Design a protein around this motif. Structure first.
Motif, PDB file in Angstrom:
ATOM      1  N   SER A 157      30.789  52.898  32.615  1.00  0.00           N
ATOM      2  CA  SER A 157      31.738  52.175  33.451  1.00  0.00           C
ATOM      3  C   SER A 157      31.834  50.698  33.079  1.00  0.00           C
ATOM      4  O   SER A 157      30.824  49.990  33.074  1.00  0.00           O
ATOM      5  CB  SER A 157      31.366  52.311  34.919  1.00  0.00           C
ATOM      6  N   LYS A 158      33.048  50.229  32.792  1.00  0.00           N
ATOM      7  CA  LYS A 158      33.274  48.829  32.483  1.00  0.00           C
ATOM      8  C   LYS A 158      33.457  48.042  33.784  1.00  0.00           C
ATOM      9  O   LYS A 158      34.318  48.387  34.598  1.00  0.00           O
ATOM     10  CB  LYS A 158      34.512  48.671  31.597  1.00  0.00           C
ATOM     11  N   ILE A 159      32.623  47.007  33.994  1.00  0.00           N
ATOM     12  CA  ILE A 159      32.699  46.150  35.172  1.00  0.00           C
ATOM     13  C   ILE A 159      33.476  44.928  34.740  1.00  0.00           C
ATOM     14  O   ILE A 159      33.023  44.191  33.861  1.00  0.00           O
ATOM     15  CB  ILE A 159      31.302  45.791  35.701  1.00  0.00           C
ATOM     16  N   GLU A 160      34.698  44.771  35.276  1.00  0.00           N
ATOM     17  CA  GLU A 160      35.630  43.735  34.834  1.00  0.00           C
ATOM     18  C   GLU A 160      36.199  42.864  35.932  1.00  0.00           C
ATOM     19  O   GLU A 160      37.049  42.025  35.628  1.00  0.00           O
ATOM     20  CB  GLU A 160      36.830  44.368  34.114  1.00  0.00           C
ATOM     21  N   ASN A 161      35.803  43.072  37.192  1.00  0.00           N
ATOM     22  CA  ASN A 161      36.352  42.263  38.281  1.00  0.00           C
ATOM     23  C   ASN A 161      35.351  42.085  39.424  1.00  0.00           C
ATOM     24  O   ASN A 161      34.255  42.640  39.369  1.00  0.00           O
ATOM     25  CB  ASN A 161      37.719  42.818  38.748  1.00  0.00           C
ATOM     26  N   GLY A 183      35.588  39.766  28.961  1.00  0.00           N
ATOM     27  CA  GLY A 183      36.946  39.250  28.802  1.00  0.00           C
ATOM     28  C   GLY A 183      37.694  39.208  30.121  1.00  0.00           C
ATOM     29  O   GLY A 183      38.014  38.126  30.613  1.00  0.00           O
ATOM     30  N   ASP A 184      37.903  40.378  30.743  1.00  0.00           N
ATOM     31  CA  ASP A 184      38.555  40.431  32.044  1.00  0.00           C
ATOM     32  C   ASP A 184      37.681  39.837  33.130  1.00  0.00           C
ATOM     33  O   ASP A 184      38.197  39.142  34.001  1.00  0.00           O
ATOM     34  CB  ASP A 184      38.961  41.865  32.408  1.00  0.00           C
ATOM     35  N   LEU A 185      36.352  40.071  33.086  1.00  0.00           N
ATOM     36  CA  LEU A 185      35.451  39.509  34.100  1.00  0.00           C
ATOM     37  C   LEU A 185      35.566  37.967  34.179  1.00  0.00           C
ATOM     38  O   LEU A 185      35.643  37.411  35.265  1.00  0.00           O
ATOM     39  CB  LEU A 185      34.009  39.952  33.824  1.00  0.00           C
TER      40      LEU A 185
HETATM   41 MG   LIG Z   1      39.214  44.437  29.630  1.00  0.00          MG
END
Ligand SMILES: [Mg+2]
Ligand SMILES: Nc1c(O)c(S(=O)(=O)O)cc2c1C(=O)c1ccccc1C2=O
Ligand SMILES: O=P(O)(O)OC[C@H]1O[C@](O)(COP(=O)(O)O)[C@@H](O)[C@@H]1O
Ligand SMILES: O=P(O)(O)OC[C@H]1O[C@](O)(COP(=O)(O)O)[C@@H](O)[C@@H]1O
Ligand SMILES: O=P(O)(O)OC[C@H]1O[C@](O)(COP(=O)(O)O)[C@@H](O)[C@@H]1O
Ligand SMILES: O=P(O)(O)OC[C@H]1O[C@](O)(COP(=O)(O)O)[C@@H](O)[C@@H]1O
Ligand SMILES: O=C([O-])C(=O)[O-]
Ligand SMILES: O=C([O-])C(=O)[O-]
Ligand SMILES: O=C([O-])C(=O)[O-]
Ligand SMILES: O=C([O-])C(=O)[O-]
Ligand SMILES: [K+]
Ligand SMILES: [K+]
Ligand SMILES: [K+]
Ligand SMILES: [K+]
Ligand SMILES: [Mg+2]
Ligand SMILES: [Mg+2]
Ligand SMILES: [Mg+2]
Lengths: 419, 436, 424, 424
Positions: A157-161, A183-185
């Protein structure tokens, strides 16, 4: 002495730092896996062979770009480059294939993600990096979209926010692992807080014994320059010191002018950083924090890691069907390499997610008596270890096996002298 | 709490309230003391051996049977008193009482026989009476010698020479009784099998208020070396005439166990006193309480940090087995041993799990009582044709005896320690087994 | 010098583990520090003579216990008068004068809460100016409140040490400790009320909890029992005294050994000799670290100054911490961190000087001079009196470093200053 | 009480953790920093950051030390940059809340030994009253002695920060640190002189040894490199700044980011924001314990007072430690124990006020009132000046506890007092 052993014998973390020596050369094999994004700059079979030699362990396909036809060709080229070394176990190294989803966008599981996940199952991908996971039900949706044929695929799972960070515990509970998608985080939360989220998530994953990937802009300047900045080498070294199982390259390999050099740089930094790990405190804290267990695989794993540290074992050779016995050894961060001998090609690829696990795919004919079959797999681990430089005659190894065939029965640890 | 939550749900809150387990889970020694609970009952078998001096008050076969049932593990014969004929009769009575229980592994309990020498007296080395007494010991098959007034390494070499070629297997426990013995402790320990803190003479040879320093130092060094240490003299002194001990005496026995003593001893309390059986029962009751109060979290961490790295597979297997036992709260560690050495190396890490030592050697079964937490099982069956089957039968004998004797229950985890080839010195395997 | 670091078990003190600390204990390493664990001697027919009491004070007696389970009020009033006469015979030398506390040990409730005889004995204690009450068979917090009510408004300054002697007292320990000034592990009755083999667990638990709370704890009964008739104790008895000090007891006690035995002076000398050896064997590196970690955060300036002063004393190996105190509280808060440096408590209160013997490592100095008109000069004269008494008694030498703990205004409760001073 | 909200901010749950692993697991992105930023920011002053108006913005953003790189420009060019820094600094002299001293540091061009140009540039520094010298390519102790000799008769108070930029400097680190006032980990040249992948080992080693020695250490070069052309840094760059603070750096630096880039003010703001977050994430429980254990015993009263004051500050969660210092040394000895409390250093020396920016967590207050005839009154006036500046700047409120560090007599070198004060 070599591999920062004076710093390893220090009584405090402060004295450990004071004893770090730039002249103490790393001797152990690189433990932290490198994930390289495969794109326009790194798609050719010839380029992929150089990336494998440079140290790439996992090939990432970013489904935010390209098409199904484009990514299928990249997958075929990765498999062709990997199989070009199958003539000899010295050259042979399994490489996992990971599919990174486009994500939900405007918002739950998107229809494009369902089609891309189905593509992954049909093309036999090993791992899914699920974008923008913000709750446990997002993981269940990815799992459902993989269907009955994708039951063995690992979901990272990508944690991005902010929501992903706040609901981290529930996400980790149902995931196979986590990716700190910086990047998004770094856009979703203040940029100056990303390091706190990274260190917290790596610490919690280390505690849970589940893989954690550090990702994005690790060697960013190498997209156009042959050498990285001082901040970039520091970032890679600190991700390894934080406890990351994997480090990743995105634009550096997908579209940059130096994809092979970026992989070589991550390899060189990771080896140096792994020797600088303060194992005396790390093992003591992992031991203390890991709960008591009545599972024989868990009990054998801690006994084996304790035994390895007692004799400075060159390796822990483990037999695994699913990769689980090797994962439970990896969670205690032994200095000894965990040589995982498996007949499963998928488990051999997936086990790159766990730090310090070196997969050996066993393709020798079976022995008639099971105890003899086990013994030949152990001798195969030893011969591959001698060939690859892990072992020498006179070394001690710890051998981890089970009492009966099939997964779930690991319960034995043996101390063996090489040759 | 998360480090014990799943095991608490599985084993129950009652399991974690007994044997000072809340005090065992403490993060500091101060918190460990604060959590000691008089309502937390000991569950484990008594691991510190009791040495009882056999004399006029404890010589009869009927009295010796009571002493064995009360907990006596080692019978001491003090060659400062009696004669060869007198001590030979005491030895015969001990063996007769021991053999009365030799009909089942659940009822049998080996008892070691130790000879305590008169000593050098005003002489600078081995006396002529000691040479004759040591020869008597070899001829009568004694297991251990407690050598009086050992002052230097050459004193133990002289005792070893007097035992001759036939007494090679006898353990030499050097008694430290004066200033010179304390000062030359390291050289004495190096050549001895173990040490006795002989507090009677030590308390006259050095200031009485310094004996506790010598005791704690010698116990600590013996624990560090992995060699047996005995605490001796006046532990329950008032019980020579009274049925109950003083507050200082129960405290002294508990503190000898907390210090790290492998054995505790009774001298006049059993040799000439009016309550020999009660003195053994009291040491038994106190030792069980004190063993549960040991702060294993710090002890095991310090034993690991202090023990040097080892390339000996028996040593490597022992630390792995003790670590595994602590991880699952194993009820026991079953070990196969010829000389007792594999059980001694497990014992040096002070596991909470009982070390069930399965051996064919009757002498090794008696001698392993010197090592804290080792429970000897004498295996009498003739060897199986296939060595691996013979090993399996011995392990199953340990498990079945363990279940029948209350050490093991269905659902328990047990750690099994064996070797890959026959003969002494090849222990290299640790197995985790679930009891069914 | 190298000789300094070979004495008082300093090699064992520098060890990195408790196991290595034990391995480094040396019988040739002589104690240098003054004995910090107080000795309580029970007064009886063997120790009532004024001349015998002077010898007991010289041997090391700090607290005289009156056991109201024996004798009438007239008998105890005579004991008190003889103790005061022997104590005041050394008052002509104020730099060496040793205060001795008077503690009243109650008969107890018997088959009954507070008995009617205890109410009369407690009122006798207040009328005769006793310093401490050892309250027998305390089983709950309300037993302590009853003792406090029986002392009345005139006995507000008397310390109440609750004796834990049965299963209920052990089980309700936390609530009893919260309302008491301290605890006595009364092992005689405790060893009859609970199994004898469990007493050591109750003793170690109560000492640990008292050390954590920073309240005095006394280990009592049969410590040197054989010395009632024999000139030398058994190996178990010397071990018991040493282990009570290593456990963390502030005080050790003598009962029949001084009240009725044949060797009262020798029993006091033996406890003195053992305690000095055992105090040097304390592993301060772990003890201070654990006391510091367990002690909660505080906004009280006396508490904040005390931890700063103890940390400073350890940093320079200070020979002493000199503290001015009205009620003894500033010295108690220094004592709770178990400094190796002696806590020299200078006070004008004769009662606080007697009562601070309950706290390990506190050496009371009773200052008799009338106040200087300038308060800052009066504080300095008191600090100089601490230094001169310390030099005379062997605590200090020229060149030593000392930590000085004072406050910002007169009156109790205003300690807030720590100062590093070089002895000249 | 302080409240549950107080204990949720500044990573206090992570600060109370029993292990480093638990500390990491408890780090919370929602736990806001409250303390003032303690790691100083060194900004290189060049073409992009030379104007008086731009310099005022850099001071407001957080610049504490202005670096002049003598590898570029000329004496005339750098003298104008120095004059503009001083003009921008003095523009805030009318408001005690906004006024901030800013140190001036000269970074040498570099070398067989001391170059002719370096001798002339060092002489320029003395004539222009610079506070600090960053000496390029220091390889051995004799290189420092040459710089020290070149600082002539007037510049002995200038701090010499040795830049370690090659293999020889790393190998001879101990002898260089011994004679230097501090160290700069000059990563640009170091990353070319030794393998790039080994720079982090040299950085962590040198920071650890400087922390152990109690001397300032600067982390330098390419920390926010991409901000030379971009308004926001990369994920590796923010991580690098945070990790330099977590490693133990007293100062962090900006080179091209402020000297020639398009976002000099934004680069300073970014370092300020990251350092505040990273300082709250420091695991003080282990750090203080290890600094305490590793630091040798001392008979120097300033060193003994400093450890006592830092221990006292941790005990009460003191809002600040106010210290009176003429040379900055008493504040530097407090800073070496890494207190969470801000060290407010009150001094009459303008140079010491600028130079103490080298020490993490030291907030200088330049005091210029005429001296009081009674020295104790002059001390009290400066302590109250620190308290009132503290209230004005947000460090303090009525009811807060502060630790106050002073000496027993005037003149540098006599710090020996620690006091606990309640803010009124
Ligand atoms: Mg991203
Ligand atoms: N190129 C740079 C430069 O990289 C750096 S640094 O590497 O960031 O230190 C600084 C400078 C310069 C200059 O060009 C310059 C031209 C004239 C006067 C001063 C400068 C100057 O300070
Ligand atoms: O790591 P996993 O998935 O539990 O697999 C480990 C298993 O491998 C073995 O060592 C050998 O099993 P196979 O012979 O079936 O390959 C088992 O005894 C053990 O249970
Ligand atoms: O403890 P010791 O004396 O080393 O004996 C342990 C030995 O016992 C065994 O487990 C079994 O040996 P035997 O079959 O000869 O009795 C060996 O594999 C091992 O070497
Ligand atoms: O320990 P206590 O009872 O709180 O007494 C400490 C008090 O002693 C002093 O140092 C001196 O006070 P006095 O001059 O009233 O004796 C005060 O400043 C301080 O408040
Ligand atoms: O940090 P430094 O330079 O030693 O200065 C500390 C000095 O400051 C003081 O607190 C105040 O001294 P001044 O009045 O001379 O400024 C002295 O008592 C102390 O010795
Ligand atoms: O998706 C990613 O990898 C990111 O955002 O860093
Ligand atoms: O010899 C002994 O047993 C003694 O002195 O204690
Ligand atoms: O009352 C006492 O002192 C006892 O019972 O020990
Ligand atoms: O000189 C410098 O600052 C460098 O090389 O990093
Ligand atoms: K994607
Ligand atoms: K004898
Ligand atoms: K009484
Ligand atoms: K320069
Ligand atoms: Mg003797
Ligand atoms: Mg009683
Ligand atoms: Mg440079």
């Amino acid at each position: 002495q070599q591999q920062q052993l004076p710093a390893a014998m220090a009584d405090t973390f402060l004295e450990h730092l004071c004893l770090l020596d730039i002249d103490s050369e790393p001797v152990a094999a690189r433990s932290t896996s490198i994930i390289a994004t495969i794109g326009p700059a790194s798609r050719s079979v010839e380029r992929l062979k150089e990336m494998i030699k440079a140290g790439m362990n996992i090939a990432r396909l970013n489904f935010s770009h390209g098409s199904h036809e484009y990514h299928a060709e990249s997958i075929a080229n990765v498999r062709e480059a990997v199989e070009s070394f199958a003539g000899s176990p010295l050259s042979y190294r399994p490489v996992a294939i990971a599919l990174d989803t486009k994500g939900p966008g405007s918002g739950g599981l998107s229809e494009q993600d369902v089609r891309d996940l189905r593509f992954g199952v049909e093309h036999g991908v090993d791992i899914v990096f699920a974008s923008f996971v913000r709750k446990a039900s997002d993981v269940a949706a990815v799992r459902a979209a993989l269907g009955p044929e994708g039951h063995g695929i690992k979901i990272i799972s990508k944690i991005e926010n902010h929501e992903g960070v706040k609901r981290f515990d529930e996400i980790l509970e149902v995931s196979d692992g986590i990716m700190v998608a910086r990047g998004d985080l770094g856009i979703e939360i203040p940029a100056e807080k990303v390091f706190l989220a990274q260190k917290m998530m790596i610490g919690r994953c280390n505690l849970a014994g589940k893989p954690v990937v550090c990702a994005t802009q690790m060697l960013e300047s190498m997209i156009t320059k042959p050498r990285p900045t001082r901040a970039e080498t520091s970032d890679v070294a600190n991700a390894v010191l934080d406890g990351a199982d994997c480090i990743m390259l995105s634009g550096e390999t997908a579209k940059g002018n130096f994809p092979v050099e970026a992989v070589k740089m991550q390899h060189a930094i990771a080896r140096e950083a792994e020797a600088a790990v303060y194992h005396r405190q790390l093992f003591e804290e992992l031991r203390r924090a890991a709960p008591l267990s009545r599972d024989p695989t868990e009990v054998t794993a801690i006994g084996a890691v304790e035994a390895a540290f007692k004799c400075c074992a060159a390796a822990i050779i483990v037999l695994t069907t699913t990769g689980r016995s090797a994962q439970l050894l990896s969670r205690y961060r032994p200095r000894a390499a965990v040589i995982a001998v498996t007949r499963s090609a998928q488990a051999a690829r997936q086990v790159h997610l766990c730090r310090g696990v070196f997969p050996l795919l066993y393709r020798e004919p079976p022995e008639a008596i099971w105890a003899d079959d086990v013994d030949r797999r152990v001798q195969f681990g030893i011969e591959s270890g001698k060939l690859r430089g892990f072992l020498r005659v006179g070394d001690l190894v710890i051998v981890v096996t089970g009492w009966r065939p099939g997964s779930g029965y690991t319960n034995i640890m043996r101390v063996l002298s090489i040759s």
